[PDB]
Amino acid sequence: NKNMADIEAAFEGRVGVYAINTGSGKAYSYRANERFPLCSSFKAFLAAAVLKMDQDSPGVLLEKVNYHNRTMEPHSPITEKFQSQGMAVGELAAATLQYSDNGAANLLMEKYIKGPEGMTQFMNSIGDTKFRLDRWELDLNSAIPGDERDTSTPKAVAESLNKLISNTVLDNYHQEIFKKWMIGNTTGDNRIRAAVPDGWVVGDKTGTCGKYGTANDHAFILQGNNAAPLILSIYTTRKGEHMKHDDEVIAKAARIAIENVK
């Protein structure tokens, strides 16, 4: 528990961590360039791609999407609620990020982003050449060791998140929406957020494949007093198909990474 190698050994699996202090440049890396399953964590970038489409076509966020005749994907807490009358594109983006909504992700990749291929192209176009999304929900969650489908690296995820808040892709209006969505994420209280002092503000997106004990979290962290953000990216997976994940391992890794870049 005092260092990342000991956390990983006791977890019995693979832990990948990249953190950077965007003010000082201090970074921390542990298997930062190895591949891990994305699970739900791509959904933050999907929401950002929808924001960019609206940036490039003002009004997209208010277009309405109807899906009355759909069999809703498991883990669709918002889209199942609104099925009777549809949802605005911007609320689908908010739902897929803040609630990890699976229906919202597939709907947006069916009608706006051009499938998993289009998701990958968006990431590629901002300079992320590690990210690949290959399949739809929920098959993208298989998390098979050695399978590079639907994977990225901890460092690539961190760097892409930084790009999305550092004026390289989204204008300041759309960046602010993206950052408010991340800060309002509902699913991360037991991961990176569990490692930060009260008073710091965290915007994060989690992922939990349900296979191979695979779970992750990436975030920007605002210490306050106008400090530049910390970026943290933490991915884990294990060898056995039905092994369970462990939130506390991610939180322990977060404490180490924060200590080394703060």
Ligand SMILES: *C(=O)N1C[C@H](NOS(=O)(=O)O)CC[C@H]1C(N)=O
């Ligand atoms: C994403 O990985 N998922 C969607 C949903 N949210 O859990 S999450 O916040 O950790 O991402 C349920 C688990 C998982 C899935 N089975 O799709």
